[PDB]
């Protein structure tokens, strides 16, 4: 007929049956628009299959889902056509599912035979699985004939529709089953310890002298004297040459040796103390082990080792003022200015996000911690976490004693401040940007021992520790890649500009990484549903404009266009794999799910809807009867030839000898041309 029913979306082009020139004008618009939609569906179904790949990340259970993903155009078109057109069986949906089987079984398999490189074969390793699955796919189209012609002919019942749908879970369970199981003595005077240790700031060191043995009811006279070791008398210790007397009944005496303190860094030094001239008042007593002690001097005059407490600090943005601690760890002697500053990174300073600060904090003597006050400024907006940096500079030992200002060889102007430290007048360096009367200032302007003293005293300089750089972090792209990839050799330019509208439109699909592939899955299946709503309309109005039947336009055009996703899936598995299971199984898996979901769901919805109205669901069997029997007769020939290529002369289903490779491909293309030509004639009652 030349009269066009109104589609789901597209309105009827009016007036109807206008002329002969206008039919050519209208059908060209409908054909080019339909071919452009087929180009769009292949792009979005490729992305739909890639999302399924990510969700399930080569098994039969994984491949039956990929065969399900590429069959969405056939499955959705049959469901949309029934529900869109008031639950009435239309020719376009069932025929593009039966017509897809011919294209899948013959044309796709013929192409998979040929794409395998010359000299290489692809053999079905798992032949038991192939027999069961291929029989089930061919039975799907035989069972379609049964419900239309054998059991209650011309009508689809509720149980017929549901039983068609419930064969789909049988495909799912068999896939899971196949992976698990089908695939698989006189008195003596001596020291207590013999080696004492004291700090430099103690002032006195406590040694102990013990008399034991003989008779304790006697008097013992002994002398002690301190002699220089690596520490020198008058500079490091106080010289003492006292006398120790032991009363009768007394066994111990405490002697104290003074330690002269200063502020100069020194290494560990020691001195020797000796006892002799043991005498008794009124052989009897003599010195024994030990009689000489080595007393160490630990020196605490190191001016500090300056570090931040920790590398990374996490700060709430709505905070008034930070207090970063700068720790003077390894000692303290004299005031030491330590410059600091703020370095802005992501958290740009200048007052907008923090108040820029820099200055010269000054430690005092014997003060091991000070704080740096930087104030974060919060903002209303919710933004990304921002960072900025805090760094201290090289310290300066500003204040020192008189004699330590010679060892350090400071030649700047000096001030005599009031304070006294370890009994010595204490000077402080003049710093620029401060002004003296300039009468007040003193300017303080080798023997192989003095140079040693300078070298050791230059190890008490203020230095920087482990962490001199502290990061302050404030606390409250794949989309772009798709659009850059969307828009980017003459043949490539033709294909790029043809599909640039589709690639930019489908770059709004969420990237597959989100929601573990599900964000891409929901949006892709919606767009596939939208573009097969248009294809159902464009193919419907194309046929009635030129008088072509919906049976013919579905078999030739719509069936070929919706199997483009299936063709590339099988072609890649034919070449890249080692066997022919995945390539052929995608054809078999597609054919089964086309009937069980495409016709099973669509005719379940229609039969139930008419049953609620107490009415039968009538599908005319004659158009579909000859198509499904022509397919099964042609399918056994295809399956028979595939099994015949298992001989060692050929070696496998795919590839093989080049002369046999063309004959198998040309035969299967011939079977498809014979199918679509005979089916077109039977549609038009030419037998």
């Amino acid at each position, epitope marked *: 007929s030349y009269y066009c029913k109104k589609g789901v979306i597209l309105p009827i082009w009016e007036p109807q049956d206008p002329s002969f020139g206008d039919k050519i004008a209208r059908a060209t618009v409908y054909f080019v628009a339909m071919v452009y939609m087929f180009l769009g569906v292949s792009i979005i179904a490729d992305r739909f299959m890639s999302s399924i790949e990510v969700i399930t990340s080569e098994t039969v259970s994984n491949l039956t889902l990929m065969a399900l993903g590429s069959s969405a155009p056939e499955i959705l078109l049959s469901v949309i056509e029934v529900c869109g057109h008031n639950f009435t069986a239309g020719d376009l949906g069932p025929s593009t599912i039966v017509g897809s089987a011919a294209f899948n079984m013959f044309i796709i398999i013929a192409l998979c035979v040929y794409v395998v490189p010359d000299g290489e074969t692809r053999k079905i390793k798992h032949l038991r699985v192939f027999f069961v699955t291929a029989a089930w796919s061919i039975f799907a189209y035989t069972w379609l004939y049964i419900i239309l012609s054998v059991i209650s002919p011309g009508v689809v019942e509720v149980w017929e529709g549901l039983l068609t749908f419930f064969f789909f879970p049988i495909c799912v369970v068999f896939a899971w089953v196949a992976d698990r199981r089908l695939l698989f003595p006189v008195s003596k005077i001596f020291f207590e310890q013999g080696t004492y240790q004291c700090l430099e700031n103690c002032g006195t060191v406590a040694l102990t002298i013990i008399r034991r043995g003989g008779d304790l009811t006697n008097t013992v006279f002994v002398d002690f004297r301190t002699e220089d070791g690596t520490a020198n008398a008058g500079s490091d210790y106080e010289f003492t040459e006292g006398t120790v007397v032991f009363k009768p009944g007394d066994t111990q005496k405490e002697i104290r040796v003074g330690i002269i303190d200063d502020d100069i860094f020194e290494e560990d030094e020691n001195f020797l103390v000796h006892l002799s001239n043991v005498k008794v008042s009124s052989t009897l007593a003599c010195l024994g082990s030990p009689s000489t002690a080595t007393v160490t001097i630990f020196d605490d005059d190191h001016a500090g080792i300056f570090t931040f407490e920790e590398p990374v600090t996490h700060v709430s943005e709505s905070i008034g003022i930070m207090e970063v601690k700068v720790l003077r760890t390894s000692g303290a002697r004299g005031n030491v200015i330590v410059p600091y500053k703020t370095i802005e990174g992501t958290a740009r300073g200048g007052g907008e996000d923090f108040e820029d600060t820099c200055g010269e904090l000054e430690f005092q003597n014997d003060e091991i911690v000070k704080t740096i006050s930087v104030k974060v400024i919060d903002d209303e907006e919710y933004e990304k976490n921002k960072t900025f940096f805090l*760094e201290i500079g090289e310290p*300066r030992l500003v204040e020192m004693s008189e004699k330590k200002a010679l060892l350090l060889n*400071e*030649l700047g102007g000096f001030t005599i401040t009031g304070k006294y430290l370890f009994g010595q007048p204490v000077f402080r360096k*003049v*710093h620029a*940007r401060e002004h003296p009367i300039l009468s007040t200032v003193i300017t303080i302007a080798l023997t192989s021992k003095e*140079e040693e003293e300078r*070298r050791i005293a230059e190890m008490g300089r203020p230095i920087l520790g482990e962490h*001199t750089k502290l990061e302050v972090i404030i606390e409250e792209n794949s989309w772009r890649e798709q659009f850059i990839e969307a828009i980017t050799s003459c043949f490539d330019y033709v294909m790029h500009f043809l599909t640039v509208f589709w690639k930019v439109l489908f770059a709004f699909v969420p990237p597959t990484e989100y929601w573990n592939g599900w964000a891409c899955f929901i949006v892709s299946i919606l767009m596939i549903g939208l573009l097969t709503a248009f294809i159902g309309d464009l193919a419907s109005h194309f046929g009635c404009t030129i008088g072509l039947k919906d049976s013919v336009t579905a078999v030739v055009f719509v069936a070929l266009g919706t199997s483009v996703p299936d063709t590339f899936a099988s072609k890649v598995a034919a070449t890249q794999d080692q066997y022919a299971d995945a390539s052929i199984g995608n054809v078999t898996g597609s054919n089964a799910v086309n009937v069980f979901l495409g016709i099973g769901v669509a005719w379940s919805i229609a039969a139930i809807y008419h049953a609620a109205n107490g009415e039968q669901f009538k599908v005319s069997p004659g158009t579909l009867a000859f198509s499904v029997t022509l397919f099964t007769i042609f399918a056994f020939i295809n399956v028979g030839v595939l099994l015949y290529r298992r001989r060692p002369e050929i070696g496998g289903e795919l590839g093989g000898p080049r002369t046999a490779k063309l004959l198998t491909s040309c035969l299967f293309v011939l079977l498809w041309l014979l199918y679509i030509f005979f089916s077109s004639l039977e549609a038009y009652c030419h037998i």
Partner: antibody
Amino acid sequence: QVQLQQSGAELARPGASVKLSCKATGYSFTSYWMQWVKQRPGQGMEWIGAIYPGDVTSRYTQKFKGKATLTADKSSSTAFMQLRSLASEDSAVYYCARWSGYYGSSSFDYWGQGTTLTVSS
Amino acid sequence: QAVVTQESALTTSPGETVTLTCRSSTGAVTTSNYANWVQEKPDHLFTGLIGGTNNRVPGVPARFSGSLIGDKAALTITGAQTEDEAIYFCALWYSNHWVFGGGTKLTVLG
């Protein structure tokens, strides 16, 4: 506009003393360290020391401690290096380099053009 | 006391990437050595490139980048021009005194 004007070429006899002057202009002299670097052809470069012209705080390596004395003159914005007891190995090129005082930044931001010192008789 | 070692010379071509090495004798350079890179142009024109192993001097072109690779410091110039034909020195702090390298006389063909 930071420029460090290094002193002109010097010729001295061995055993004498020479004084070299890096006249720093273009920035805050009394808040930046000045580093002195010795370069000899084939022996790489040797760090002599650093001076802070603010309060005349000085740093030196052990071998250059008695050899070089670093001095500054904040009135005329010039830093000085005095070499004493000159010998044949002191024939080199001496550079002055600006340092902010922070190890996270470059210690050798801006250099002088260098004074060549010739010690021969 | 420690010695810093480099390449004697290392040629490259304009537009190509180049990596310069700086190895300490005591072992691996850490972030506490503060590896500095300076450059001399002919007739004694020195310029400071990189501070504490990452920080770049303002005004130094963005192609110069410093990093740590393995047990040694690295200067990488991505797409060097003819203007980068110079001698590059590396300095290590060693907590008391800067120790310089020998200098790589990088040369670019023209």
